[PDB]
Design an enzyme around this catalytic site. Sequence first.
Site, PDB file in Angstrom:
ATOM      1  N   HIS A  89      -7.658  -5.961  -0.210  1.00 49.73           N
ATOM      2  CA  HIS A  89      -6.527  -5.140  -0.101  1.00 49.73           C
ATOM      3  C   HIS A  89      -5.145  -5.824   0.438  1.00 49.73           C
ATOM      4  CE1 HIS A  89      -4.229  -1.358   0.141  1.00 49.73           C
ATOM      5  NE2 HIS A  89      -4.134  -1.300   1.473  1.00 49.73           N
ATOM      6  N   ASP A 144      -9.931  -4.760  -4.209  1.00 49.85           N
ATOM      7  CA  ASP A 144      -9.510  -3.770  -3.030  1.00 49.85           C
ATOM      8  C   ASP A 144     -10.375  -2.664  -3.243  1.00 49.85           C
ATOM      9  OD1 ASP A 144      -7.482  -1.920  -2.126  1.00 49.85           O
ATOM     10  OD2 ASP A 144      -5.885  -2.930  -2.718  1.00 49.85           O
ATOM     11  N   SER A 183       0.773  -1.100   0.018  1.00 55.01           N
ATOM     12  CA  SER A 183      -0.128  -0.248   0.070  1.00 55.01           C
ATOM     13  C   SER A 183       0.845   1.039  -0.046  1.00 55.01           C
ATOM     14  CB  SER A 183      -1.136  -0.034   1.133  1.00 55.01           C
ATOM     15  OG  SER A 183      -2.032   0.605   0.836  1.00 55.01           O
TER      16      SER A 183
HETATM   17 CL   LIG Z   1     -10.483  -4.274   0.576  1.00 52.61          CL
END
Ligand SMILES: [Cl-]
EC number: 3.1.1.101
Length: 265
Positions: free
Chosen positions: A209, A178, A132
Site C-alpha cells: 500500500h 495492496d 489513499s
Molecule cells: Cl498492503
Amino acid sequence: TNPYARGPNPTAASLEASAGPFTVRSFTVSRPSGYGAGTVYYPTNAGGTVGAIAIVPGYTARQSSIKWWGPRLASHGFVVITIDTNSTLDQPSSRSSQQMAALRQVASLNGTSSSPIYGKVDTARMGVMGWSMGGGGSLISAANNPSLKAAAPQAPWDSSTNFSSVTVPTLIFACENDSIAPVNSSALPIYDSMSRNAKQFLEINGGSHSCANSGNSNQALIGKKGVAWMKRFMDNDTRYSTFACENPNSTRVSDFRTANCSHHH
Ligand SMILES: [Cl-]
Ligand code: NA
C-alpha cells in the site's frame, strides 16, 4: 512558444534522477489556514512562474509519508505543498477541502511580500496528489474543481468509486499487492469510472500500500511518471507527451492502462 515551458528538454535519465534541474528550498507554513500543517517546496531559479501542487497523506499519516514528492516535483519547476490534516483521522471529503485550502494558501503566499514564494506561482495552474484517503480526496478535489490541471493520486480510496464527473487529467498510481485498498475494489474501479478525461493507471509490481511513498524503491520510475504527467498537463508541455503517455514496459509495472492521453492530428 508555450509560455509555461520551463527547464531543459527532458530525457529519461533526467526524469529518473533524484533531482531535476532547479535548486529547491522549503519553508513550513507559519499559520496554516484550513488544514493542520504544511511545508512548501519551491524552485529558486525556475525562470518563470510555475504551477502549484497540493499533496495529502492517508489515514493516520503525516507529511513524512509523501514528503519525497516535494523536492522531486519542485526541482522540475513546481511549487509543492505537503500537508498534515487537522486530524489524522479525517475522511476523504475533509481531506479534499483541506487540500484546496492549501492551494488557496499558496495563492495567498504568492501575494505576500514576505514569503519566499512571492510572485513565483501562476495561480491559474494547479494540481492535486495524495495517498489513499488523500488520493480519494484528490479525486474529489478534481471533481469539484474542474479547473484543476492535473491529478496524480497514489493507492487511492474513497467510499464511492464513481468518479465519472472527473474531467481533469488523472494518473492513478496503484500497488499490486495492496491489502488496505485493494486494487480490484479501489483503484481500478475508480480508473474505470472516468470516461471524460485523459487518464492513466500504473500499478507497481509486488507493491504494498505504501509503494509510492517516501522511501519507496521505485523512485526513478514513479518520479519520472509523476513529473511527466504534471509537466504535460499543468504546463501543457508537449515535450513530455511521450513520457506521460507511454507504457514503461518495465518489470516494475504489473498493470498499465491509458486513455485519451496521446494527441491525434
Ligand atoms: Cl498492503
Ligand atoms: Na486553520
